[PDB]
Amino acid sequence: LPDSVDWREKGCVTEVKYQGSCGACWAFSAVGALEAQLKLKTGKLVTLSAQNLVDCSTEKYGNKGCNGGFMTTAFQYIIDNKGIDSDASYPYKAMDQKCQYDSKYRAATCSKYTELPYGREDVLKEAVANKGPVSVGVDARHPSFFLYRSGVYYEPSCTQNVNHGVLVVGYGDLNGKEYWLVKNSWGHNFGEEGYIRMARNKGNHCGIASFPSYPEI
Template identity: 80%
Template sequence: MNWLVWALLLCSSAMAQEHRDPTLDHHWDLWKKTYGKQYKEKNEEVARRLIWEKNLKTVTLHNLEHSMGMHSYELGMNHLGDMTSEEVISLMSSLRVPSQWPRNVTYKSDPNQKLPDSMDWREKGCVTEVKYQGACGSCWAFSAVGALEAQVKLKTGKLVSLSAQNLVDCSTAKYGNKGCNGGFMTEAFQYIIDNNGIDSEASYPYKAMDGKCQYDVKNRAATCSRYIELPFGSEEALKEAVANKGPVSVGIDASHSSFFLYKTGVYYDPSCTQKVNHGVLVVGYGNLDGKDYWLVKNSWGLHFGDQGYIRKIGRELSLNLGKQSFIPLILLVRSQCQKEESLVNRRSVYKTFFSCMFAEFFTTFKLKVAILLF
């Protein structure tokens, strides 16, 4: 039992003074059955019930205000409805961000470029199914593999779920990552580069806990050559990157109950700050009823939001999307080059690799991007 649960139990006697509402007994039982909730101790259930009632009141009042046109999104009592904001952040939102990041912006946007009004990479088959990270602060790993999965699809035509557990177990001390206790998306990418690959989800399944590194190069499903960083505070650069390159790993502030209880609509909470604590994947953008939004894939399962997505996070009034200090984007997957390398002898390996690299850049990202990176 983790320390958060112990803290709940220690204060449960005090909380018990706030008598639960007996008229909600049936709905509490229905909610527990719906999400398979079971509690080991009676005191824990008492504490959870009181948290649930508090969240239910928040949801009910918010949705009443939504019906009166006061909000652009609705809330719902999902599987996280018996948790506090502090618990959700501690257990499921452990993105690490350096206090002083040595910025190395390599992405240059084109202000004269005409971009599509909307984009959804799910429609192009570049996004895998929504995952559930469980009580493990591995959001950074799921965000990273999500970006790479799309690039693998764009380069090879195959959509493969990559192993977040590989990153949790293996990209550890050397990279400043701490598995289920949090990590850096940038260092997840760097591990894949240094390790010359990452396993597939099928060969290295997710366990939602820290474990011994079991990476096997024979099961390598993808690799990348580098990642790029978007300019600080540039939402136009983010829009251009999403439109032209694919889904982008980003960090956001997810510390509010309005976030983890989100159900549908264009999300906007004015209390959101620039404190980045959760890694997600931007898979598109658009406009609904005059409100710009980012289409965001989360890793909290299908019960969160709209089938696992915060489908519409306001772009003009967003949660700092594009305003945090780094947004890595995978540009090149080397799997195609590696296949060619296996067909030639050692002396021609580097020649083959660079030939393939330039070919991919010229066909996919145009000459100006190749010049930028080389």
């Protein structure tokens, strides 16, 4: 397997988004994963509607809009719905709204999704190298997480009990410190232009490999 991967270099990652005061991290992680598959399958990079997920993948999917949700059930909604709209046609408002999905603006579909084995960083590495960006949950309930600025993030208080959905878009090592390249949804001002490099192969640090999943078109 390659020693380093960065899907941004292959044009498979859209601009970093900003969720604001809405807990839509799960929606952003899910569309981020599908946006990469869309680029790989059609040759075009389009940001997909996180709002579509927030407004439409609700109770039936165990999701609570701005109060939280799951990437896996978001993918199921896209499968059941037979599509998800473009972000351009269905903009993010950081608020719970009525469902306004319209197939006229469908920008992608999802036929299935895959869940990786609990805590296996080696399997996660393979998937990121061979399949593409992977949605994961991390333990971000530590003030050091939002205050992260650069380098490889390591928080001794972290645990494997996850609560924040993000997207792994690569991996590598910074002078010997292995890491996962993670795209967040806290805007361009967070971390390294919207990304955080999290410790890799350090005992499933922050639970990054606890619940990984990726969709396929």
